[PDB]
């Protein structure tokens, strides 16, 4: 069978917590109430939820309404405990309250609102520094929920909610997150296709905190090279192949072969052999700008294949690619 996994760091940390911290099936809900939010106007809708912006009319200030759809009481729990564990962590979307939504019979989450702008607009316009800037505090919020024994497992540019007028950052979006546990093989359906880990594309299950380091990777590549997504599958089985075609089969191999993992024999008619590309490659007149050596270097240490090869969310705060970007 395969070989086990531990993450190299926050290892043990929900084993010395209180049971009742990662015990979200146990957890009680604490209601607010429902006629302090009037909903304004829906902002998008989903397989699990349906956001809208609402204004809390106690204070009379917008906030953010998710009213989730119906799904098991226990992932409900499983997003509302970690929202509560990180409530008041670094750059974590604050949740302020939860109600229960009488027609959709459901529970609402209620989080604080960010007066954000498309990142589809966003990127177009992000400079050199500014993406070193808000890369630092992605990873402000991923060290932090790590160190809090939590993955999020959906890192990807739509749960990056900027406010770039007051250079405000919040991650949001944790209703894949997951509590990790040294040993426990988790779900491999989680992430956006173009972010997903290779660990999630050959169905290894005993991953960690480092998933989202990968993920992290995925957005750096589409900013710095301005190629959004970066890695483009059509489906999970072309987007290993995507990978393979930048990182290469050899160390594909070297990977599963060190976690004593097979590839679906369906990748014997699409994989092909390719060598390792040199990151060069992707610069050109339109994106130099965003690249520099350091830039190349930190992108090449978040995109391994091996989930225990690549930096953690606070050796990558150490990289020397963040030494411009001015410190509070
Ligand atoms: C505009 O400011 C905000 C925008 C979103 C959030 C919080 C969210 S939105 C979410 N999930 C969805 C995202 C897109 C579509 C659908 C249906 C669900 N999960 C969260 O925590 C908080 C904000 O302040």
């Given at each position: 069978?395969?070989?086990?996994?531990?993450?190299?760091?926050?290892?043990?940390?929900?084993?010395?917590?209180?049971?009742?911290?990662?015990?979200?099936?146990?957890?009680?809900?604490?209601?607010?109430?429902?006629?302090?939010?009037?909903?304004?106007?829906?902002?998008?809708?989903?397989?699990?939820?349906?956001?809208?912006?609402?204004?809390?009319?106690?204070?009379?200030?917008?906030?953010?309404?998710?009213?989730?759809?119906?799904?098991?009481?226990?992932?409900?729990?499983?997003?509302?405990?970690?929202?509560?564990?990180?409530?008041?962590?670094?750059?974590?979307?604050?949740?302020?309250?939860?109600?229960?939504?009488?027609?959709?019979?459901?529970?609402?989450?209620?989080?604080?609102?960010?007066?954000?702008?498309?990142?589809?607009?966003?990127?177009?316009?992000?400079?050199?520094?500014?993406?070193?800037?808000?890369?630092?505090?992605?990873?402000?919020?991923?060290?932090?929920?790590?160190?809090?024994?939590?993955?999020?497992?959906d890192?990807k540019?739509?749960?990056?909610?900027?406010?770039?007028?007051?250079?405000?950052?919040?991650?949001?979006?944790?209703?894949?997150?997951?509590?990790?546990?040294?040993?426990?093989?988790?779900?491999?359906r989680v992430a956006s296709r173009y972010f997903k880990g290779?660990?999630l594309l050959?169905?290894?299950?005993?991953?960690?905190?480092?998933?989202?380091?990968?993920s992290?990777?995925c957005?750096?590549?589409?900013?710095?090279?301005?190629?959004?997504p970066?890695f483009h599958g059509h489906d999970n089985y072309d987007q290993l192949?995507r990978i393979?075609?930048?990182?290469?089969?050899?160390?594909?191999?070297?990977?599963?072969?060190?976690?004593?993992?097979?590839?679906?024999?369906?990748?014997?008619?699409?994989?092909?052999?390719?060598?390792?590309?040199?990151?060069?490659?992707?610069?050109?007149?339109?994106?130099?700008?965003?690249?520099?050596?350091?830039?190349?270097?930190?992108?090449?240490?978040?995109?391994?294949?091996?989930?225990?090869?690549?930096?953690?969310?606070?050796?990558?705060?150490?990289?020397?690619?963040?030494?411009?970007?001015?410190?509070?």
């Open positions: 069978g395969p070989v086990p996994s531990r993450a190299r760091v926050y290892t043990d940390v929900n084993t010395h917590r209180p049971r009742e911290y990662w015990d979200y099936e146990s957890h009680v809900v604490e209601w607010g109430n429902q006629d302090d939010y009037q909903l304004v106007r829906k902002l998008g809708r989903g397989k699990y939820s349906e956001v809208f912006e609402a204004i809390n009319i106690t204070n009379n200030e917008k906030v953010v309404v998710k009213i989730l759809k119906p799904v098991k009481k226990k992932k409900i729990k499983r997003e509302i405990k970690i929202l509560e564990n990180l409530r008041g962590g670094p750059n974590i979307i604050t949740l302020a309250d939860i109600v229960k939504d009488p027609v959709s019979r459901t529970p609402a989450l209620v989080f604080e609102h960010v007066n954000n702008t498309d990142f589809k607009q966003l990127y177009q316009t992000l400079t050199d520094y500014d993406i070193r800037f808000y890369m630092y505090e992605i990873l402000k919020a991923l060290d932090y929920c790590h160190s809090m024994g939590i993955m999020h497992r890192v540019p739509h749960n990056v909610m900027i406010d770039h007028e007051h250079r405000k950052l919040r991650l949001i979006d944790w209703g894949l997150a997951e509590f990790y546990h040294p040993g426990q093989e988790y779900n491999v290779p660990e050959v169905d290894y299950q005993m991953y960690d905190y480092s998933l989202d380091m990968w992290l990777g957005m750096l590549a589409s900013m710095i090279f301005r190629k959004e970066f192949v393979a075609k930048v990182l290469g089969t050899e160390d594909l191999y070297d990977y599963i072969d060190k976690y004593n993992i097979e590839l679906d024999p369906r990748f014997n008619d699409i994989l092909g052999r390719h060598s390792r590309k040199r990151w060069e490659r992707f610069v050109h007149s339109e994106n130099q700008h965003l690249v520099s050596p350091e830039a190349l270097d930190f992108l090449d240490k978040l995109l391994r294949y091996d989930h225990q090869s690549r930096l953690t969310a606070r050796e990558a705060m150490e990289h020397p690619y963040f030494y411009t970007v001015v410190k509070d």
